[PDB]
Design a protein around this ligand. Structure first.
Ligand SMILES: Cn1cc(-c2nc(C(=O)NC(=N)N)c(N)nc2N)cn1
Length: 245
């Protein structure tokens, strides 16, 4: 997250921290995700496509820091890694950039909700907020495009939804953006998602309910003028989510 503010898991208790085991046993951070039910985390396919084996991944819930444990956290193996059959990657754009992870502990249990662990509601179909609506994004991604490290503490920020028409402009992303994607950005281009935030939540208040509106997918650079963040439009994938859960 470029700009924004540090936070803790209590302010985004559905946030899932996803890591990969190597290859000799070091564990490194991969991507964010969102807990949509006790057994199911939703994320982006591009996070897993190069290493599509479920046994390679570990999922934490209730975690506020990257490389140290948070009191009350839960650790899960991935019982099921489901990537979207119609995934494609452009140079920039990822299409159908959506993935489901079925989580199960070594004791064979799913998530127990707590103060640090809760589910996030899915939107109703084809129902998103209007352009200019402020939403929040959360993740452990880079704080500056030039950074080598990821922040050790969880971050969040606010970005405003951009209309498909505006995002379609050549000055922005041309036809790289489809109606299954949402754009969002700061009016000053001051704050944004970045590398390491992929898979995490874009959350909007809709009807007085906190709703998983988007999943962090791609962008050209980070917090660059005329280059918004691009998000998988969750309200266009409900049957896929329904069917696979
Ligand atoms: C070199 N590079 C990588 C990125 C990158 N960017 C994003 C990204 O979200 N960018 C943005 N909102 N402007 C992302 N989710 N993942 C990435 N790997 C941007 N520049």
């Amino acid at each position: 997250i470029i700009g924004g503010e540090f936070t803790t898991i209590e302010n985004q208790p559905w946030f899932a921290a996803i890591y990969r085991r190597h290859r000799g046993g070091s564990v490194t951070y991969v991507c964010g995700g969102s807990l949509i039910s006790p057994c199911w985390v939703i994320s982006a396919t591009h996070c897993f496509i190069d290493y599509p084996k479920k046994e390679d991944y570990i999922v934490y819930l209730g975690r506020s820091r990257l490389n140290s444990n948070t009191q009350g956290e839960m650790k899960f193996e991935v019982e099921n890694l489901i990537l979207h059959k119609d995934y494609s990657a452009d140079t920039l754009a990822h299409h159908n950039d959506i993935a489901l992870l079925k989580i199960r502990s070594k004791e064979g249990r799913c998530a127990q909700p707590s103060r640090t662990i809760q589910t996030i509601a899915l939107p109703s179909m084809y129902n998103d907020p209007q352009f200019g609506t402020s939403c929040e994004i959360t993740g452990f991604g880079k704080e500056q495009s030039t950074d080598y490290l990821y922040p050790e503490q969880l971050k969040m920020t606010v970005v405003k939804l951009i209309s498909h028409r505006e995002c379609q402009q050549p000055h922005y992303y041309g036809s790289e953006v489809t109606t299954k994607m949402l754009c969002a950005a700061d009016p000053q281009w001051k704050t944004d998602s970045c590398q390491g935030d992929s898979g995490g939540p874009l959350v909007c208040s809709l009807q007085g309910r906190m709703t998983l509106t988007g999943i962090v997918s791609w962008g050209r650079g980070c917090a660059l003028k005329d280059k918004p963040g691009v998000y998988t439009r969750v309200s266009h994938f409900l049957p896929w989510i329904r069917s696979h859960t």
